Design a binder for this molecule. Structure first.
Ligand code: MG
Lengths: 313, 314
């Protein structure tokens, strides 16, 4: 298999090394100049389970890709959501009608960007439980075990999804085909589409939010909107268990006393949030599917208003 | 001679009471303030009325005292704040018959929905009072200046009696007029107050700061649309463009742009409970009964109530 890894961060580097070792043609694409230079000069150097592994993998920045580059069977997308479109536009010369994409991004709706570059039937989604650390440019620390669960988003993509599993198996990645990955991503986005935005706007921690008399109605209204949109994509969220899952976070002996990650980005660090890929994505989908998602719409607008007020970058 | 009960005998109710008494009407005061009841029972209601002392020996009762031995009245004038209106009208029911009308003088939206539990819906009038009144002490008010009252029947059957109330108020010197814009102006005002108030409160910012946001147009217009959708069901047709234009004009730092709206001062400055239930909460309540979606009103109401709880507002 010819594989391009779009985003050669810690996870991308792990996957690249392992797939290389498994006998595949691997090309890295990355936006960190020092990292690129280091890999070009000394190879990708991994502290891989106490053993040094050096892999001489081709690497390019997106601006360097053109017609001359080799075409690939699979692109593994690790590029963060806000650079995804730009990354895929750059690597277009490497894509044919037969090219598949495995999207390993967090959050929702990435297939709307990806379908501009690749048929929908060619899109796979995955979750990785591997860990990885970058020690510096061209150097990664790889420890522990893990696995990758993946799923075709379109029923025509099943055969190739199984072929990616086989490739990943021979590379030691511990893959499985799972009919639950899209559901788990939807379910997680639900969690991230409640506490994140609501704590950020109201300015409070998780247990403080949970204790509000309005918390039940706000959370449940938001879950229902995620569920209404997900249903159009043949994902049927268990709304009662999603609610039970969120209610458990309120426990002060658990993470109750923590502030959610969106609070940390915006309120603590004045950085732009992930809202466009959570409630913003449900809203975008609702608009295309003629499903009303007003709480997601308003929460998205309020968070964007708050970002601008705090001069978030 | 109309029999008139004043529900809420504060400074304004006291003005109306005295003046309607001077016009020869049969006035009864209803009030929740014990010291006020005691002073009025001892010495009558005392007004410093344009530099002259006027005393009016009016009957006065607390709501809990009212029973079927009390007089049944032609008109109740409602001035009790919204938070106590329901309990006030439940208590004064013994004074209401099928022929009793209410003139609601409260600020804000949707009070007819409480009143109609106690007074026939056909008999509800709404008005705006431009008079001023001050409270000097229990049973003692200070009345200066001029004013007027504009009023309107809510139900088309209430028109003749509304006109009769105007006549009564005219003779009492209250400068009344019948106005077919009263309900509209109340809706338009609530619409304005249903945007910047909750939004600046939740986001923590002033009016111009809010206005400049790239989401200000979308937030404001969606909220306006919800107000208009529900008003339409009650045969009030809001000019959504005019309302938006008014809101944009508030962004001007030469005008009120640098100010914070009243709800912000209530909650964010003073840690006091907001009026949200009688603005966005009222649109939301009506929308539910009319099968009209009002989700921005609903969410904004819940967020404001959320913030009240977080700040320990009282
Ligand atoms: Mg700005």
């Amino acid at each position: 298999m010819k594989i391009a890894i779009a985003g050669a961060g810690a996870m991308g580097s792990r996957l690249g090394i392992m797939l290389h070792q498994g006998g595949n043609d691997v090309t890295l694409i990355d936006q960190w100049p020092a990292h690129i230079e280091a890999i070009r000069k000394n190879g990708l150097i991994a502290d891989f389970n106490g053993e040094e592994v050096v892999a001489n993998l081709p690497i390019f920045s997106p601006e360097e890709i053109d017609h001359q580059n080799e075409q690939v069977d699979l692109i593994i997308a690790l590029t963060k959501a806000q650079q995804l479109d730009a990354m895929f536009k750059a690597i277009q010369p490497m894509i044919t009608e037969k090219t598949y994409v495995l999207c390993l991004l967090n959050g929702l709706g990435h297939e709307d960007v990806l379908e501009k570059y690749v048929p929908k039937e060619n899109i796979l989604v995955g979750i990785t439980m591997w860990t990885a650390g970058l020690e510096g440019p061209g150097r990664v620390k790889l420890l522990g075990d893990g696995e990758i669960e993946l799923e075709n988003i379109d029923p025509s993509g099943k055969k190739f999804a199984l072929e990616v599993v086989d490739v990943f198996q021979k590379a030691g990645l511990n893959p499985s085909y799972s009919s639950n990955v899209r559901y788990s991503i939807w379910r997680k986005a639900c969690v991230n589409g409640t506490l994140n935005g609501l704590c950020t706007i109201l300015d409070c921690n998780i247990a403080e939010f949970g204790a509000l008399p309005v918390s039940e109605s706000l959370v449940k209204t938001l879950i229902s909107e995620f569920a209404a949109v997900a249903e159009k994509e043949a994902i049927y969220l268990d709304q009662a268990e999603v609610y039970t899952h969120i209610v458990q976070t309120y426990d002060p002996n658990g993470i109750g006393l923590h502030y959610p990650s969106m609070y940390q980005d915006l309120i603590k660090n004045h950085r732009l949030t992930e809202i466009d890929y959570i409630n913003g994505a449900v809203w975008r989908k609702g608009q295309k599917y003629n499903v009303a998602t007003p709480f997601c719409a308003m929460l998205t607008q309020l968070v964007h208003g708050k970002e601008e007020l705090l001069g978030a970058k």
